[model samples]
Target: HMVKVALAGCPNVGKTSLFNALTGTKQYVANWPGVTVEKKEGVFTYKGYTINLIDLPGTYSLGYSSIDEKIARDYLLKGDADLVILVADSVNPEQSLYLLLEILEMEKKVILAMTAIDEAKKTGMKIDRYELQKHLGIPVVFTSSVTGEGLEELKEKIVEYAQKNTILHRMILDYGEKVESEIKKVENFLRDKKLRINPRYFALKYLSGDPEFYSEGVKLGLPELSEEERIGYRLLIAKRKREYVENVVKEAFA
Candidate 1:
């Protein structure tokens, strides 16, 4: 059986390099979404498993604006991603940490890998993989596309984590009293859909004030409401999501 693995990481993190080694293909030679810069996807075989890979353009946050962000958002929200592989720069993990928090919200099996490890060692920076795994709430792997270290171990971890985890579990959010109640209201309203996604995630999106909700609204076939009504409901939703983000992600530092 073939499982899909989505590759995500910030730009210039040697993600493409690692991907090249894993899939043995040219990452730059592909056509993808218009705003998404470009992405490369390849299939690789490991341990009697066939992995269908999807590469996503690097982005700092999940917030959609540029083509890259939009592509990232559209794929996570709409694509058939079975697992998420997030790349990190060993020298600079701050950006990667924040991105990890955002991916946590999307509710997917994620693996964190630090690239450019060789470069880090040259700079006299030591990375404790065990410590990183404990902090990230998931397994962490170190890789060097340059020296080809940790490649086999990385695939072994993937083989272990992939099948066991086809589900994406989201971290819960606490958005205070009023906002939390509103979130409940939205969740209850959308709850009966047997959602392909988590209601809490929808609640978070509503609270976060996603402007692109109208497009989703159209897809969901939500009818037109009065100007005040539309504004009021959307505001309630966005406020609830933002509040949840602000509270739950407070320590997350996003």
Candidate 2:
């Protein structure tokens, strides 16, 4: 059997190093269709399974502004991979957690790879992996390409999760009662549109005033909020996500 997995993370988060460590010389490089951004693919075998790994361009968020973020977002939205291994710096996990929250809202199967663990330990940083896993409600693996730590365990998680038929019970971020009511209203509005997008994700983006989704929703007959109102929702959503990230980091890292 083959498991299609995508390695994703923020820029300069040791993502490429981990990809190289996993796939070694068996790698292919090319450009994404119609774009100059590089695309990477590689293969590795573990536990009687061939893992087809794609290294997506490092992106901070799956927003529509940058070409890199767009490619990564489009690829994942296409459901091309069975699972995503979200790599994060062990010492700096807040940004990665924010990204993870976005991916979770998409209902994708994900495993968090806390990379650069060696550096974290050397710098006297302590991470409670189990606590992180508990808070995120997903598997968290400590890894370091430099030390070859947790690579095998990550592979095991990949194969194991890939074979599962059940959908992931993802963590959901509550955007408070008032905002959540608006999100649900948007979700209900999209339900009958027969769109391919996940309603909740679309609703969150639409309500959070993501420019891409806002314009699209406007065209799709969604109620157009005033500029000032949209900005209020945007700030509220950002605050909630940031608060969640900070709380999780504080609880899991010392």
Best-fitting candidate, scored by lDDT: 2
For candidate 2, which ten residues in a row score worst on lDDT?
163-172
For every model shown, the clashing-pair count is 12, 0
Instruction: Give me the candidate number with maximum TM-score.
Output: 2
- C-alpha RMSD of each candidate structure in angstroms: 5.2, 1.2
Quote the RMSD, in angstroms, for model 1.
5.2
Q: Which lDDT values do the candidates have, in the order given?
A: 0.70, 0.89
What is the TM-score of each predicted model, taking all chains together? 0.75, 0.96
Estimate, for each residue in 178-219, the C-alpha lDDT of model 2 and write its tens digit: 989998888888877976777888887887678678888989
User: What digit string (tens of lDDT, one per residue) describes model 1 on residues 48-81?
Assistant: 8988778888887777667788888778778887
| Candidate 2 residue 171 C-alpha distance from true site, Å | 2.1
